[PDB]
């Protein structure tokens, strides 16, 4: 009793259906079908133990993902989808091109990334800033990440290997975990930028 994708679909198709009769005239049998399918989907959500909101969000990525064209599509508006291929920058060019020195170097090889940190830093609030390319709602390839103190000094760096580009997003999440652990082991408070939180946790 598992193939309940049809419920998610029906939750999606109903909500958009509402829109029509919920703003324009639509039709009276159409609105009657709206109310009837509403009650039926409520009963199915009760007997399923599955939320309508969550199943509609699932209907989003279960429908909008396999709409290929028999014939010529919804001209997936670029005002609403450019797609979302962008490049995010927490760091300034000065911050990027700046050179730094570790008193107690720690170098580790996390997959295709090199993590570097100054172990001498202790009891500081550190913030992570990174410049990286984003595709859709996922990180694609990292250009650089660095760790700044409350005062702006560099204390850590996640950089891809010069000979071995590129990498995935999960490799970057692993490197982030390793760097945060190595730094917080020295009594350091680690905060992260909003973009990094968005594509790292």
């Amino acid at each position: 009793p598992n193939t309940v994708s049809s419920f998610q679909v029906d939750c999606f198709l109903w909500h958009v259906r509402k829109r029509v009769a919920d703003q324009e005239l639509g039709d009276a049998p159409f609105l009657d079908r709206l109310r009837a399918d509403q009650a039926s989907l409520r009963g199915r959500g009760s007997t399923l133990g599955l939320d309508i909101e969550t199943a509609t969000r699932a209907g989003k990525q279960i429908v909008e993902r396999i709409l290929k064209e028999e014939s010529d599509e919804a001209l997936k508006m670029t005002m609403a989808s450019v797609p979302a291929s962008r490049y995010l920058t927490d760091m300034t060019l000065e911050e990027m091109s700046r050179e730094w020195s570790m008193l107690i170097p720690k170098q580790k090889v996390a997959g295709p990334l090199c993590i570097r940190m100054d172990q001498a830093i202790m009891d500081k609030n550190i913030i992570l800033k990174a410049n990286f390319s984003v595709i859709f709602d996922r990180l694609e390839t990292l250009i650089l990440l660095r760790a700044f103190t409350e005062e702006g000094a560099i204390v850590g760096e996640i950089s891809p290997l010069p000979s071995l580009p590129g990498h995935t997003a999960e490799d970057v999440k692993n490197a982030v975990g390793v760097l945060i652990g190595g730094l917080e082991a020295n009594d350091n408070t680690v905060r992260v930028s909003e973009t990094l939180q968005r594509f790292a946790w």
């Binding site: 005002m79 291929s85 962008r86 490049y87 920058t89 060019l93 990027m96 050179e99 250009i143 010069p162």
Partner: protein
Amino acid sequence: SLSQASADLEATLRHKLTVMYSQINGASRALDDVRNRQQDVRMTANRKVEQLQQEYTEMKALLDASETTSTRKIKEEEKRVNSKFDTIYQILLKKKSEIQTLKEEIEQSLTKRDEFEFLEKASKLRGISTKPVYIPEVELNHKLIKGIHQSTIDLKNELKQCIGRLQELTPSS
């Protein structure tokens, strides 16, 4: 003293080689960074331009709708007056046909004239001059159509003022 200082500066220059390697790699990462930043602002500019063009095409479609609605109001007023005139044409042609028929009836009644019954046959037809029918006046609503024209000119002038208000917000190169 010079051979050991030679080894000393060999070792110091060797560690300087590694710091150079790391800084050159940092420079390559900064070059990728600047390239990706310019690529991002290119994408942003193109996206904003296509959103602008989509908005201006929506405005053009609204203008098309307004144009069609105004021309439909004008054609419906035209067709009103012209169908009143068509019914008047129909009435006048009916009366004209009655008179034409009676005229030909008198003309071919004058061929059998030297029989006594000609009087009995034709004294009725001098009496029947059924020529009535009242026609009310039809007036095209000039004020309405000239007001539509005046008001569309006013809307054009108001769009002029609107676009001026829009463009004065930002600098022009």
